[PDB]
Ligand binder design. Sequence first.
Ligand code: HEM
Ligand code: HEM
Ligand code: HEM
Ligand code: HEM
Lengths: 143, 143, 140, 140
Amino acid sequence: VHLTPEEKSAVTALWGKVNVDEVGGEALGRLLVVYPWTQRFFESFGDLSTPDAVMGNPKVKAHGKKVLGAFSDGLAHLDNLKGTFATLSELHCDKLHVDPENFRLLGNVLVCVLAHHFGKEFTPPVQAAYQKVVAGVANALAH
Amino acid sequence: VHLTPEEKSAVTALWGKVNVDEVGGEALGRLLVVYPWTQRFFESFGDLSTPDAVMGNPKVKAHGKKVLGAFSDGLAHLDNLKGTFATLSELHCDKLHVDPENFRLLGNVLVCVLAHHFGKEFTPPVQAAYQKVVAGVANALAH
Amino acid sequence: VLSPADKTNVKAAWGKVGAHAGEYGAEALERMFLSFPTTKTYFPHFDLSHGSAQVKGHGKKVADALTNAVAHVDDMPNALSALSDLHAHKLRVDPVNFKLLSHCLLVTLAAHLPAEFTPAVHASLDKFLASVSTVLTSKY
Amino acid sequence: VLSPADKTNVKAAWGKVGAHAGEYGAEALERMFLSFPTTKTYFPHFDLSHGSAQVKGHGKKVADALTNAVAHVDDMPNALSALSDLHAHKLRVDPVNFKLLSHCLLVTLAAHLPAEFTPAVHASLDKFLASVSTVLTSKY
Ligand code: HEM
Ligand code: HEM
Ligand code: HEM
Ligand code: HEM
């Protein structure tokens, strides 16, 4: 994804202050709560009935950390998103059968989680830069 | 767009029996009727109030002829769609500001027009091959 | 949110569909399976081959549900409540799949009713199928 | 259909928004313009720069419409009928843009009400904004 030098610098600086363990689980849990049809892919995680049970699920927390680790790996390689996400794209398409629209839903949920965590520091320019990175990761995963 | 040899042979044979002037205007007119927000782009063409006015519009017919010519050009180059659809992608993005979802809507409308024209000859395998070509043209235009 | 004109269009088109409803539903399901293979993952226990009796019976059920929706067009949300509960709460179907099935139903209708598939009837049927999908994707 | 619990959450979230609604609407519009520049084509006569009084007034109008929708959550379709006619028949706005504005509104609400933006409130607000977008895109 092409970003200006200011956009890339802002994206990396906000990312450094991200807590890897907390943010990804919160985005995965909020995806599962807001879009309840996504629980079809995670019914093996255990109890996902109430939002309080979804956000208190260690499996959801651990999977979210792996999803955020993948997001960080994509962020470190913004010029080769289609290359860093090839194996994950194959995994999500051929064996899991996940629609590409759900990747965009998860990216928007992650943007909301970042806004919730950073408040006024999540300026509209930072949000625009993160929207483009999230769309690029979704497009790379959808290939 | 990757297709089997049988898929490519079936797609080309159905395309040979397509009437270039009639099919594209019918797909453009049906797009304008079924999805009325698309007339924002075609306001210059003229009266588009009723479906009868839309389908009896010479500007709509001529533009549909152009669009179907582009579709045929993409069909003749199915292995380089992103290359043949680069100038059109730039035109539809930078100057016209058309959403990529509308390309998929138009492709589905074209598939319906082909089914309506060819009847029982439009078998489910032919439809599947044509859906893949239509998605590839939409992805190439959305680049 | 449908109008009396498109309601009349839908009633006429589905009445002309008539007794071919189950066959048309099976054909639409076959088209969806062939064109969008991801939708096959919702039917892991089915035989999804051509001429399959399981797909034929399911298409009959879907066509009967659509016929009931046409007959109860003014009260679809409470006419399709059990189906809404099944598809949303139990099956957890992505709404994109509802869009895909509506498209394949439209393609079958176009291929089988050339004269009936005018642009006005096409728009009416698109709106009716969108209404059905909206009802079936609502969680209570 | 909007759940009574989701309805209570939306009223508490928007009541806590309170008098900051016009600024939140203007900031959401700014976010939409910045992240989705294709939406700026609907405002060709506007000054869409940062701190623009035109965007500030439009955000005030959008926030007042959302406040009225919250106050009339039971009867949004006829509480927002003039807005539906304006957006669908006159402006011809793509529904994808309604989705984008709803997302930017959610982002503004998250950035301004951290404690209030629980996952349950987030889901309630997402579905309330989806219902508003559905009403505004309904053509009749
Ligand atoms: C949008 C960006 C996404 C990224 C970067 C991402 C990342 C990942 C990663 C790194 C894994 C590896 C887990 C492993 O190998 O054990 C994974 C697995 C998985 N992903 Fe995603 N994911 C994304 C979106 C989604 C969405 C939207 C869904 C479902 C709606 C989903 C469903 C799954 C499932 C079910 C697994 C396997 C988990 C299991 O079997 O326990 N992913 N994902
Ligand atoms: C696969 C989808 C599409 C293809 C292959 C296609 C192809 C074309 C072609 C060949 C032209 C003529 C370019 C020229 O004359 O230089 C054109 C122009 C145009 N297209 Fe499309 N198009 C597609 C989808 C759409 C959609 C969905 C819309 C609107 C909703 C749209 C709006 C326009 C407009 C407004 C013009 C310019 C017409 C004018 O200025 O009079 N196109 N497109
Ligand atoms: C207009 C749209 C649809 C209609 C009218 C419809 C109708 C029906 C009906 C009548 C049944 C049988 C329920 C019963 O016998 O109690 C059923 C079941 C089912 N439907 Fe749908 N459906 C629609 C869309 C979809 C879509 C898009 C999918 C998946 C992509 C889907 C997946 C299923 C599944 C998996 C079952 C269970 C069948 C079984 O396990 O035996 N449905 N539907
Ligand atoms: C999603 C919730 C929305 C609400 C509550 C809303 C509300 C409003 C209101 C109250 C007005 C002023 C009408 C009047 O004063 O008579 C307006 C006008 C307008 N809206 Fe929206 N709107 C929404 C979505 C959108 C979106 C997504 C777009 C475009 C991307 C849009 C484009 C416009 C335009 C172009 C105007 C005309 C303003 C002018 O020309 O001065 N609206 N809207």
